[PDB]
């Protein structure tokens, strides 16, 4: 590719540019069809190396630090096998959740509204969100609805989980949540809903739209809910928090941690602990 015609002086020009690039990275560079977009991507691609080597340099510096102390310097009940035992324990709990647990739906029908940066970030929040469900005392039955098998979102999920994808204790499906559940019990959670969520209802299916629009697109989740006949609710952030800073649309890992706290009889004081403290000045 001739796209090297930009990089090979942009390094000499004085802008921050990474030294190691591949054709796969080079391909995504040419979709950036403006000077600022290319500069923004190159800045991201440059800082990837910057924290890599800095953390790289840290780790073998530690290797010398421990190898000198490790080489120079009884009755037990259990073998030290806890990480294996914890994973098995969460597996049994997840298997029980898939049968009797309350369903929670992550709507994957937002692939067409996301750029590559946003789509990748959605998976990262999805990975953390499902991780917190596993470690909970009373896990949800997590559903991935509207997830196209060949779609971009599915391929990214497979790449991140690798072998674990086929072994996850969650129900991923092509069908919409309206096909799996009665339309009366579905409550599409969205920040733009005019109805404020008062109490957590254990006989309802809460739908979270897996949409991370860093280029914020208000009303997208509400439009989907009103395109169907689904009811909507919004978190009582204004009721219990003194907001000052930032968007009121929380991340997927914060949302699931708020719902999990509510499901475990926690009040709104404990549940809203997971709203970033940088966005408000205390609970009232």
């Amino acid at each position: 590719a001739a796209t090297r015609e930009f990089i090979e002086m942009w390094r000499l020009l004085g802008r921050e540019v990474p030294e190691h690039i591949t054709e796969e990275e080079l391909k995504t560079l040419m979709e950036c069809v403006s000077n600022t977009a290319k500069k923004k991507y190159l800045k991201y691609l440059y800082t990837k190396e910057k924290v890599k080597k800095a953390r790289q340099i840290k780790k073998e510096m530690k290797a010398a630090a421990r190898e000198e102390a490790k080489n120079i310097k009884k009755n037990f009940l259990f073998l030290r096998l806890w990480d294996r035992n914890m994973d098995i324990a969460m597996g049994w709990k997840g298997a029980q959740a898939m049968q009797f647990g309350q369903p929670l739906v992550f709507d994957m029908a937002y692939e067409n509204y996301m750029k590559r940066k946003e789509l990748q970030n959605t998976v990262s929040q999805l990975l953390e969100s499902e991780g917190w469900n596993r470690r909970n005392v009373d896990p949800f039955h997590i559903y991935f609805c509207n997830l196209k098998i060949d779609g971009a979102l599915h391929r990214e999920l497979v790449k991140r989980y690798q072998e674990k994808w086929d072994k996850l204790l969650l129900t991923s499906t092509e069908k919409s949540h309206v096909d799996l559940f009665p339309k009366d019990s579905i409550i599409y959670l969205t920040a733009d809903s005019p109805n404020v969520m008062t109490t957590f209802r254990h006989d309802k299916v809460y739908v979270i739209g897996s949409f991370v629009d860093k280029s914020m697109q208000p009303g997208t989740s509400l439009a989907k809910a009103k395109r169907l006949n689904l009811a909507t609710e919004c978190l009582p952030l204004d009721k219990y928090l003194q907001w000052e800073i930032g968007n009121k649309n929380l991340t997927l890992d914060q949302m699931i941690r708020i719902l999990l706290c509510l499901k475990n009889n926690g009040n709104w004081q404990e549940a809203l602990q997971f709203v970033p403290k940088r966005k408000h000045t205390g609970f009232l």
Partner: protein, 255 residues
């Protein structure tokens, strides 16, 4: 009731044995802590007052136990209850193919010496001491309580030696109860699950929370005081004989 009874509690300087002694002495009974000399038994016996004394002895030695039983007769005049809480735990895989490591036989023998062999050594000797007692209104001469573990039913990976020793205690509880039935001595066994003994509490807080969460209900490690409560219930109830009671909060240990 347990007031006026004399209890010999092997391994009574710590853990379940110490909790049993504290409750029985508090309820009005007298206790003899039979533990190793290196343990803090002397301090514990002093803390419990004049109704509790410390008899240093190794349960694996016949001579040591007989001297301890003589001490109980000297101080209190008779033996009414024997509680066998002394025991050690060893975690070791039977064979590890990747590491080429085979379970050491001496590891198996020492666990069997203290848990299984030590328990029976106390039982055969303390039974003769209760055989000198005049039967009460019910015709009973004494109560013998052994401490097995849940590993006797679902042992985990690396508990081959521990489960075998504890499984043997479950094995002997009925035949010994049959042996001592003419005499009038009851034999019972308690199988505690995960308990807040110094063995478990010394573990990192990360794994302590996990072990507590594994118990269905209550989701916490067993209080040693709860073991003491069940020991008293067996003593007071005349119709409990030759039975293993699991005190584990319905936990079934995973591999």
């Amino acid at each position: 009731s347990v007031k006026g009874l004399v209890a010999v509690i092997t391994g009574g300087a710590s853990g379940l044995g110490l909790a049993t002694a504290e409750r029985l002495v508090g309820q009005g009974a007298s206790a003899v802590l039979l533990d190793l000399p290196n343990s803090g038994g002397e301090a514990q016996a002093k803390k419990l007052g004049n109704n509790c004394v410390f008899a240093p002895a190794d349960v694996t030695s016949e001579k040591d136990v007989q001297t301890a039983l003589a001490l109980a007769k000297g101080k209190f005049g008779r033996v009414d209850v024997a509680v066998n809480c002394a025991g050690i735990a060893v975690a070791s895989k039977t064979y590890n193919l990747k590491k080429g490591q085979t379970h050491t036989l001496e590891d198996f023998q020492r666990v069997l010496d203290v848990n299984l062999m030590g328990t029976f050594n106390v039982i055969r000797l303390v039974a003769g001491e209760m055989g000198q007692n005049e039967p009460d209104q019910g015709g009973q001469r004494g109560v013998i309580i052994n401490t097995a573990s849940v590993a006797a039913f679902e042992g985990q990976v690396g508990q081959a030696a521990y489960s075998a020793s504890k499984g043997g205690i479950v094995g002997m509880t009925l035949p010994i109860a049959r042996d001592l039935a003419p005499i009038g001595i009851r034999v019972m066994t308690i199988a505690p699950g995960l308990f807040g003994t110094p063995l478990l509490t010394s573990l990192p807080e990360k794994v302590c929370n996990f072990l507590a969460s594994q118990v269905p209900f209550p989701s916490r490690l067993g209080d040693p005081a709860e073991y003491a409560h069940l020991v008293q219930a067996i003593i007071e109830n005349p119709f409990l004989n030759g039975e293993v009671i699991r005190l584990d909060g319905a936990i079934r240990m995973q591999p």
